[PDB]
């Protein structure tokens, strides 16, 4: 089977009293166990479609079918029941709170997910130990380094073992030395149990490590054009 399908998505904005349409009928598909790369320009379309497949806005233009169910007749309360198993969100602007605990920040999507009390101190530590960050447990995000708290937010959505991770530039603040150290850990998760994810970038030299390259400009995509 094929996981994600999308067509006829004419997104239109209303703020500003001016036509700012940037999306149209994008024909994209997401496979299982296959990683792609949304090579979009700096400002073309690669933030609206990033929030549209996760079910965060209703454009009233088409259908976003996902694993057999659509996002049309989903209510405001019944949406969060389906975002626990097959969804995952990774931000790039670091939307985190600087007054929490660093060990409790990765253990936050485990209390409301009906988990065991002894399972909180087990699954939240095995992800930070494999990445090599274990000496910054009882600290605040106001005190963490520039590349320390950036690697925390990558492993935040990887605590419930999802099937689709929505990310954009994981190597934002971290350099190329910390890039391939964490790109391998994203590769073992696809080979042990199978985790399909997409990485939204702009550079062309970074996307050659993956196996599926699709370039996009203003929602238009036909082939590998440059």
């Amino acid at each position: 089977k094929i996981l994600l399908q999308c067509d006829n998505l004419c997104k239109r904005y209303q703020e500003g009293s001016v036509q700012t349409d940037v999306l149209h009928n994008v024909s994209f598909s997401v496979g299982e166990g296959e990683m792609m790369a949304i090579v979009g320009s700096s400002g073309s379309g690669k933030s609206t479609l990033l929030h549209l497949l996760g079910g965060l806005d209703t454009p009233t233009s088409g259908d976003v079918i996902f694993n057999g169910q659509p996002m049309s007749k989903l209510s405001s309360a019944a949406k969060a029941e389906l975002r626990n198993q097959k969804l995952g969100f990774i931000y790039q602007f670091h939307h985190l709170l600087p007054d929490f605990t660093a060990l409790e920040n990765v253990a936050m999507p485990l209390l409301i997910g009906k988990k065991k009390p002894a399972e909180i101190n087990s699954r939240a530590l095995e992800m930070l130990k494999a990445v090599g960050l274990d000496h910054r447990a009882n600290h605040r995000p106001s005190e963490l380094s520039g590349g320390e708290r950036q690697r925390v937010a990558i492993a935040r959505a990887l605590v419930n073992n999802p099937r689709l991770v929505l990310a954009d530039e994981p190597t934002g603040n971290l350099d190329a030395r910390n890039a391939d150290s964490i790109f391998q850990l994203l590769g073992e998760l696809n080979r042990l149990q199978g985790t399909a994810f997409l990485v939204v970038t702009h550079d062309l030299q970074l996307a050659k490590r993956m196996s599926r390259q699709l370039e996009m400009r203003d929602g238009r995509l036909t082939a590998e054009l440059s």
Partner: protein, 405 residues
Amino acid sequence: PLSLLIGLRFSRGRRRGGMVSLISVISTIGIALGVAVLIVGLSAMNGFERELNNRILAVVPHGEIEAVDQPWTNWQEALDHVQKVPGIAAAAPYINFTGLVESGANLRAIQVKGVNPQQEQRLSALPSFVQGDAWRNFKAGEQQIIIGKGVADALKVKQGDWVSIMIPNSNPEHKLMQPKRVRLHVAGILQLSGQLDHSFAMIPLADAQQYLDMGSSVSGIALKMTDVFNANKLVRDAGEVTNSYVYIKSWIGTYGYMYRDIQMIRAIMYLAMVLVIGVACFNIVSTLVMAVKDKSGDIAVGAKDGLIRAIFVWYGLLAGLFGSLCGVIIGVVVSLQLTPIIEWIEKLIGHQFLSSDIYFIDFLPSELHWLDVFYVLVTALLLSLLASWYPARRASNIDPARVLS
């Protein structure tokens, strides 16, 4: 005459970043809820205090100078001694009567007093509450008497009819005489509310001189001083030129509870109607700690410290001064023409609560007092300058450990 701290800091107050107008209508109404009802609470207490000095204090004299059960004959010299002292302005004599009335087979107690018609408007506001066309017709010669409305509610008398008022027959020898019957007529009625309307009656002074058969003698001397609170110390030091015995009796007794609730309720408003501004001033502080990040003055940025505080004391005046001038428009429509609105309180509540045992039923009062409308507006805005000064003092030394300039 635009200065340097008010001209280049006007564009920073206007902001628009999404969900702003839904929270901008909270601080300007929260600062207006304590001022729009502040002109109502200051008018309701002063409106009831105005009725205390009009129908209670203005109708009862204060200074009492009498003799040893004897008509004071030389009262012309008593008016010359205490007239121009520092504290007593004017004075007028009066003679009390202890007679009863008998009209229409109705019995009621009455304490008739003798007021001079030409010495009643200079020291008291008693004949200034007439509901007729004029009150200058009250004079002597035709035996007129003005009574209250409380007598007509029990004796069913009418204004213009003749009644029968009995007077005690006086005698310089102590014996028993026949009771006198004097037929008088009502030439106007005075209105009070419920307290002194059934015990007072006014006859002229020349009619009082003919009843007791005296030539130039009165019994008591009434006066009124400046202050209304000091009544137990000003009368005691005003009888050193008269004889050694005067009826010294201050106005204290059974009507004590009507004075305690006008002086201590005003005293507790300094901790209640000032505290409502003290809770409402927390609204302008919560937006300053909200705007302590991403602001010119809390960021890295030869001027003095007034350049940083110029954006903090002007944001409080954008919602505080606009809220005070808005609450006075909706505050005058509830203190003059009010309507009952408390009717839908126990209809759609789901589960019944508030088991009543004994309470009171609200109604509509009647008052008119409009003088504290500008003095209450200036004192509600000066403390907002100090309410933003204390966050401005702590907004100069912040380590940028979490925020990056």
